[PDB]
Amino acid sequence: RKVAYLTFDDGPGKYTAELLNTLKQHDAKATFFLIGANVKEFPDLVKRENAEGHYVGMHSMTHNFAKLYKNGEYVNEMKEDQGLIANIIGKSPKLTRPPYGSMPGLNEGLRNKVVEGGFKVWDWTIDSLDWRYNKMPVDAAAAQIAQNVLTNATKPQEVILMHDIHPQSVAAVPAILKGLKEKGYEFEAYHEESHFPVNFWHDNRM
Amino acid sequence: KVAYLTFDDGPGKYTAELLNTLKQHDAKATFFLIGANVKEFPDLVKRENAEGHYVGMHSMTHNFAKLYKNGEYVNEMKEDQGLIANIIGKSPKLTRPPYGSMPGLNEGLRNKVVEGGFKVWDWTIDSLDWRYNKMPVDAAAAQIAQNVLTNATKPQEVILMHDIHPQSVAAVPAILKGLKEKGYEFEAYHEESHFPVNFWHDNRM
Amino acid sequence: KVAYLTFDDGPGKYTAELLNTLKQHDAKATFFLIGANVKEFPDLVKRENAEGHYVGMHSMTHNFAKLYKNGEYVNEMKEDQGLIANIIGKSPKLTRPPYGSMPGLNEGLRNKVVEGGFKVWDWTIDSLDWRYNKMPVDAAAAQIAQNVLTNATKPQEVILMHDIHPQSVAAVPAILKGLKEKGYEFEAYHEESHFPVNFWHDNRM
Amino acid sequence: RKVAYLTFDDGPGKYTAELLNTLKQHDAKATFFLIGANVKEFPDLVKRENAEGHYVGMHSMTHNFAKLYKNGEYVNEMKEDQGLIANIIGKSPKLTRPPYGSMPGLNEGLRNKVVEGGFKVWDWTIDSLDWRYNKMPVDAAAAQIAQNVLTNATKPQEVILMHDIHPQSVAAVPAILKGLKEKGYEFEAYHEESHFPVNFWHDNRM
Numbered sequence: 139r140k141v142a143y144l145t146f147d148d149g150p151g152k153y154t155a156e157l158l159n160t161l162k163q164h165d166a167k168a169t170f171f172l173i174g175a176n177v178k179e180f181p182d183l184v185k186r187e188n189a190e191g192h193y194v195g196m197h198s199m200t201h202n203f204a205k206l207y208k209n210g211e212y213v214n215e216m217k218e219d220q221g222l223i224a225n226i227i228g229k230s231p232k233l234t235r236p237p238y239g240s241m242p243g244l245n246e247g248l249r250n251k252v253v254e255g256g257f258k259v260w261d262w263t264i265d266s267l268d269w270r271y272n273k274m275p276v277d278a279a280a281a282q283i284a285q286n287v288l289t290n291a292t293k294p295q296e297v298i299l300m301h302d303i304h305p306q307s308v309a310a311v312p313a314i315l316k317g318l319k320e321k322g323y324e325f326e327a328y329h330e331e332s333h334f335p336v337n338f339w340h341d342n343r344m
Numbered sequence: 345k346v347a348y349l350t351f352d353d354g355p356g357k358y359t360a361e362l363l364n365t366l367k368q369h370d371a372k373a374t375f376f377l378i379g380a381n382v383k384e385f386p387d388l389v390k391r392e393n394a395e396g397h398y399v400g401m402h403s404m405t406h407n408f409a410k411l412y413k414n415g416e417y418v419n420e421m422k423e424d425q426g427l428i429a430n431i432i433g434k435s436p437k438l439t440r441p442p443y444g445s446m447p448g449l450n451e452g453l454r455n456k457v458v459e460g461g462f463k464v465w466d467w468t469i470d471s472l473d474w475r476y477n478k479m480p481v482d483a484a485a486a487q488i489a490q491n492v493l494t495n496a497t498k499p500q501e502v503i504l505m506h507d508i509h510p511q512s513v514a515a516v517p518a519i520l521k522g523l524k525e526k527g528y529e530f531e532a533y534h535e536e537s538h539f540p541v542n543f544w545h546d547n548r549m
Numbered sequence: 550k551v552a553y554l555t556f557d558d559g560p561g562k563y564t565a566e567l568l569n570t571l572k573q574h575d576a577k578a579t580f581f582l583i584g585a586n587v588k589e590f591p592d593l594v595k596r597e598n599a600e601g602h603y604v605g606m607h608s609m610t611h612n613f614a615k616l617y618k619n620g621e622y623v624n625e626m627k628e629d630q631g632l633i634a635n636i637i638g639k640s641p642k643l644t645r646p647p648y649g650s651m652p653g654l655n656e657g658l659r660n661k662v663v664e665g666g667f668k669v670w671d672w673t674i675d676s677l678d679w680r681y682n683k684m685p686v687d688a689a690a691a692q693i694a695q696n697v698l699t700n701a702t703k704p705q706e707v708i709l710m711h712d713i714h715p716q717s718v719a720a721v722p723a724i725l726k727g728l729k730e731k732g733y734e735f736e737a738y739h740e741e742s743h744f745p746v747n748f749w750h751d752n753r754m
Numbered sequence: 755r756k757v758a759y760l761t762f763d764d765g766p767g768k769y770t771a772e773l774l775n776t777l778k779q780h781d782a783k784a785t786f787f788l789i790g791a792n793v794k795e796f797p798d799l800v801k802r803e804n805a806e807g808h809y810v811g812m813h814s815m816t817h818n819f820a821k822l823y824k825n826g827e828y829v830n831e832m833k834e835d836q837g838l839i840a841n842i843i844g845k846s847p848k849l850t851r852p853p854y855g856s857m858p859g860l861n862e863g864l865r866n867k868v869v870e871g872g873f874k875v876w877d878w879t880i881d882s883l884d885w886r887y888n889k890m891p892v893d894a895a896a897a898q899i900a901q902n903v904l905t906n907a908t909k910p911q912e913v914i915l916m917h918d919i920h921p922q923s924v925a926a927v928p929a930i931l932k933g934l935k936e937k938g939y940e941f942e943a944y945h946e947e948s949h950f951p952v953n954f955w956h957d958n959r960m
């Protein structure tokens with residue numbers, strides 16, 4: 139019962155349709171956390187992500203830690219970001235992904251507000267680190283980013299963190315898909331039907 | 345074919361229960377205690393060592409920012425070591441980093457720990473007991489047992505559990521027999537027996 | 550078995566010399582011109598296209614901080630493109646980034662270049678002609694020719710030279726003879742024949 | 755006759771001793787550029803690097819850009835650093851290696867001043883990128899860094915950039931040495947009498 143949840147952060151972007159075709163050609167589903175400025179600039183790609191069979195969840199408006207967690211704007215920005223996304227796909231998604239991860243930004247304070255707001259939070263069990271490989275050939279970057287992902291998948295479920303806004307990332311997903319499939323992983327998207335906690339605070343309320 | 349049980353965030357409310365459950369099965373495990381739990385449950389701390397388990401450290405505050413982003417880790421571990429040394433008269437070396445060492449334990453802090461004389465242990469298997477919290481104990485526990493019996497594949501395994509959680513302690517009985525028939529034996533960590541088990545694959549710890 | 554000679558930082562003092570040498574050997578190459586040298590040597594600019602060579606861009610300021618750290622790359626290439634266009638009646642697409650595209654040409658700027666309609670070309674072979682500058686020409690050139698002949702191994706090669714340097718132009722005859730013996734043919738870059746040669750291996754450029 | 759010139763920046767440091775020993779097993783020589791405060795704290799290692807056959811050059815006192823270049827203390831910091839290194843190994847080394855490289859810090863002003871004092875300046879032709887691999891298991895990092903330098907050795911001479919002050923760096927050096935040696939490289943130190951220019955400004959006065 140192996141299921142890979144490929145997640146893509148900070149999108150959508152100019153590489154997204156490309157990633158969206160590679161997903162499609164592999165009949166594989168995934169999940170996308172989007173920034174408010176990009177849901178607005180790229181409303182078609184949003185609508186398409188959802189249309190092609192993927193989960194579209196929030197990732198805030200500002201992606202600003204100081205704003206998100208120190209001043210506690212997090213859920214407000216996930217509610218605003220939610221509204222934009224509904225206006226485009228008719229769903230009001232409930233899963234959020236904290237910029238910079240919930241640890242340590244999501245204190246017990248707003249972790250409460252998150253559950254009192256009905257929202258949900260997903261961190262990740264693999265960190266592709268894709269976004270650091272920005273100073274080298276893109277094919278070389280992709281191999282190392284896939285190497286990272288292929289060699290860290292072991293648990294019955296794995297939540298893989300990637301960003302679809304960097305070229306080296308979307309170039310790695312072909313190898314990543316072919317690799318994990320050889321490892322017997324299924325490439326499903328997140329479903330709200332079947333939620334299970336994935337965070338660093340181990341708080342299973344979200 | 346050794347198998348090392350580890351327990352975090354204790355000693356706590358069900359720790360007393362757990363030590364007995366272990367005892368009946370001639371099983372020795374490892375505990376990583378929070379500072380305040382050492383202050384509140386000295387007896388349990390004393391008892392854990394007395395019944396042949398390893399008593400290691402899990403820091404003072406279990407606070408990510410303080411520990412790693414501010415580098416208080418070793419300071420928190422040494423002070424915790426002191427509190428424990430006052431009960432068992434031994435000063436343990438083995439630390440279990442709160443939330444794991446990846447990425448929290450940077451290259452620098454990893455120097456301080458090797459310099460401070462400590463080792464570091466993460467795990468290979470996560471019981472995942474925290475998912476099934478505030479939930480019907482026997483149902484939860486049952487799952488937790490599967491969670492660990494399935495990922496038991498390697499010659500040695502280091503299992504993460506938490507004895508401040510009822511579902512976890514309840515899960516321990518089923519794990520014990522299920523793993524023992526898998527050819528596993530349950531030993532405590534021994535300092536002279538040290539071998540690396542850390543996400544960074546850093547073998548100085 | 551093609552071989553594309555490319556020349557940077559021109560047109561200059563020895564450019565006319567080189568063009569005759571190219572012409573004498575019925576050989577066609579590629580030039581990447583700086584803006585001010587286009588402004589000063591329009592005839593040489595005019596001549597290069599006229600005799601069948603490719604005339605590309607090498608920016609306005611050849612200044613690293615301006616081009617990349619300040620993101621002026623495309624703009625400098627755009628304005629350079631226009632200056633060339635006013636002479637040869639074409640608006641060329643192929644850019645050769647000052648100092649190579651690595652790492653100066655980041656992911657953001659690489660979009661802009663793709664958006665503006667530009668390609669980018671680095672090289673496979675570095676002549677190292679700048680090492681031997683202000684040096685005894687006959688001696689220098691001989692070495693430089695060998696520097697490229699040694700690294701002539703692949704089916705396609707893009708050789709970096711500078712025709713603002715006397716040792717480099719002096720080296721060109723021997724390369725032409727040496728590569729012709731290696732089975733190579735010397736063609737200019739042609740846009741309908743474009744193929745990626747960029748340190749980033751970015752195949753949109 | 756190929757030659758790989760391993761260079762290590764920002765030392766000496768706590769992993770230097772292990773690097774020094776690993777170099778000595780493969781009878782391989784290399785080049786060290788050092789920071790003033792580090793020559794002050796680790797003179798055995800300086801003294802030893804030297805004594806063991808490697809070149810030791812400067813990498814400034816402060817490793818601060820605005821001080822080195824925008825304020826133009828490059829030559830000041832290299833001579834001061836040279837002074838220290840001399841009092842340890844009885845040698846005033848002439849070769850310097852600019853922090854963050856020569857481009858674009860060493861403007862023509864500073865570059866004139868550099869040749870005024872008989873200094874040379876070495877940049878590099880391969881950036882191993884070791885220091886960006888501090889967020890993953892060291893063995894994994896060691897491997898990727900290796901492949902970075904192994905798959906970029908093409909030119910008969912390479913000058914490889916590394917930092918001996920990070921663990922994943924000296925960890926990669928064994929595989930680097932086996933790798934290049936398989937490609938026919940030899941591992942020399944820089945030699946003063948044997949100077950050939952390697953800088954981003956193509957200035958062969960340094």
Ligand SMILES: CCNC1=N[C@@H]2[C@@H](O)[C@H](O)[C@@H](CO)O[C@@H]2S1
Binds near residue numbers: 237
């Ligand atoms: C100590 C800094 N931590 C991190 N930097 C990355 C961010 O750039 C991403 O946006 C975030 C969410 O996508 O995931 C990691 S976590």
Ligand SMILES: CCNC1=N[C@@H]2[C@@H](O)[C@H](O)[C@@H](CO)O[C@@H]2S1
Binds near residue numbers: 763764
């Ligand atoms: C804008 C270039 N930045 C760079 N950061 C790295 C630095 O951390 C090194 O110290 C330097 C010289 O040792 O080599 C690279 S280059």
Ligand SMILES: [Zn+2]
Binds near residue numbers: 148
């Ligand atoms: Zn993000």
Ligand SMILES: [Zn+2]
Binds near residue numbers: 352353402406442443
């Ligand atoms: Zn814990």
Ligand SMILES: [Zn+2]
Binds near residue numbers: 557558607611647648
């Ligand atoms: Zn140039």
Ligand SMILES: [Zn+2]
Binds near residue numbers: 763764817853854
């Ligand atoms: Zn440096």
